Design an enzyme around this catalytic site. Structure first.
Site, PDB file in Angstrom:
ATOM      1  CG  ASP A 182       7.354  20.514 -13.789  1.00  0.00           C
ATOM      2  OD1 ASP A 182       6.628  20.411 -14.759  1.00  0.00           O
ATOM      3  OD2 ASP A 182       8.124  19.525 -13.725  1.00  0.00           O
ATOM      4  CG  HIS A 187       6.442  17.343 -16.770  1.00  0.00           C
ATOM      5  ND1 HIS A 187       7.432  18.082 -16.172  1.00  0.00           N
ATOM      6  CD2 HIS A 187       7.007  16.188 -17.237  1.00  0.00           C
ATOM      7  CE1 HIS A 187       8.546  17.389 -16.218  1.00  0.00           C
ATOM      8  NE2 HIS A 187       8.343  16.328 -16.950  1.00  0.00           N
ATOM      9  CB  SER A 218      10.662  14.390 -15.643  1.00  0.00           C
ATOM     10  OG  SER A 218      11.036  15.423 -16.493  1.00  0.00           O
TER      11      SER A 218
END
Lengths: 4, 279
Positions: free
Chosen positions: B39, B69, B224
């Protein structure tokens, strides 16, 4: 496209 | 072990019914396993990782998670408060920039990277790769995910958040990896979750509490968010010896809560990750  | 007033999804995964608040899991909690969070990077110094996390490769100028994130994902995978596998080893592969985007070649390189790098890391119970990212259909992306998968890494990948058939959707559509749809607190398919026949399972993805950059926390939603619950569950299950990288997806599907989700389209599996914990 990208994070998900 | 039990975590009282856990975030809902942690509770969901160790429950056959929605509405519970305790997360019950085996104390091994993923130790020995490694989860490559591919990521935006991870804030390794966040207290919630207690030093179990570390950046291993960046494709950018810094190794830092200037997004969150990634840290968020790493946290549902294995931070102490918010993670599925509290003792897993987290490795950060920043294939994504601080804005959350990136190129297929860099995401494909990150994937080949991990397939090679795992060979010089000590992950006695298995290696998971969690990919809370995707884009439009790419046979090269699919392919990379399939090589990663075939190199012996359990590939968990987001189905995507378009409320569409994930068949479109890369790495999501690479049938050899594990395509993760998202669910909400009430057992309904997450309004944004992709569905279709390539999905393999569903995990909690609606307003998931996890770590954030700055040493903080934040709830956010998405496939996610469901992906790492299952990458986290795969790592937990692999450290438990229940499955292997190669058949962890199949095993999560076979042991899932079945028929519990609502709003599941004909053709899509009605399966919810479940750890099957028994005290």
């Amino acid at each position: 496209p990208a994070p998900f | 072990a039990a975590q009282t007033n856990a975030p809902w999804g942690l509770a969901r995964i160790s429950s056959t019914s929605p509405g519970t608040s305790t997360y019950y899991y085996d104390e091994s909690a993923g130790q020995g396993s490694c989860v490559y969070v591919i990521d935006t990077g991870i804030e390794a110094s966040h207290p919630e990782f207690e030093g179990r996390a570390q950046m291993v490769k960046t494709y950018y100028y810094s190794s830092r998670d200037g997004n969150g994130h990634g840290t968020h994902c790493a946290g549902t995978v294995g931070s102490r408060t918010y993670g599925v596998v509290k003792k897993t080893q987290l490795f950060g592969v920043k294939v994504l920039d601080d804005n959350g985007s990136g190129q297929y070649s860099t995401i494909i390189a990150g994937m080949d990277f991990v397939a090679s790098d795992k060979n010089n890391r000590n992950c006695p119970k298995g290696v998971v790769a969690s990919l809370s990212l995707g884009g439009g259909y790419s046979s090269s992306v699919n392919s990379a995910a399939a090589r990663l998968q075939s190199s012996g890494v359990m590939v968990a990948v987001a189905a995507g958040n378009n409320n569409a058939d994930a068949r479109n959707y890369s790495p999501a559509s690479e049938p050899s990896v594990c395509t993760v749809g998202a669910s909400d607190r009430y057992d309904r398919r997450s309004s944004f979750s992709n569905y279709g026949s390539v999905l393999d399972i569903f995990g909690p993805g609606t307003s998931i509490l996890s770590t954030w950059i700055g040493g903080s926390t934040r709830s956010i939603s998405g496939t996610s968010m469901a992906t790492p619950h299952v990458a986290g569950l795969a790592a937990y299950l692999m450290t438990l010896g229940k499955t292997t990288a190669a058949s962890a997806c199949r095993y999560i599907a076979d042991t899932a809560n079945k028929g519990d989700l609502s709003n599941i389209p004909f053709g899509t599996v009605n399966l919810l990750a479940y750890n099957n914990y028994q005290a």
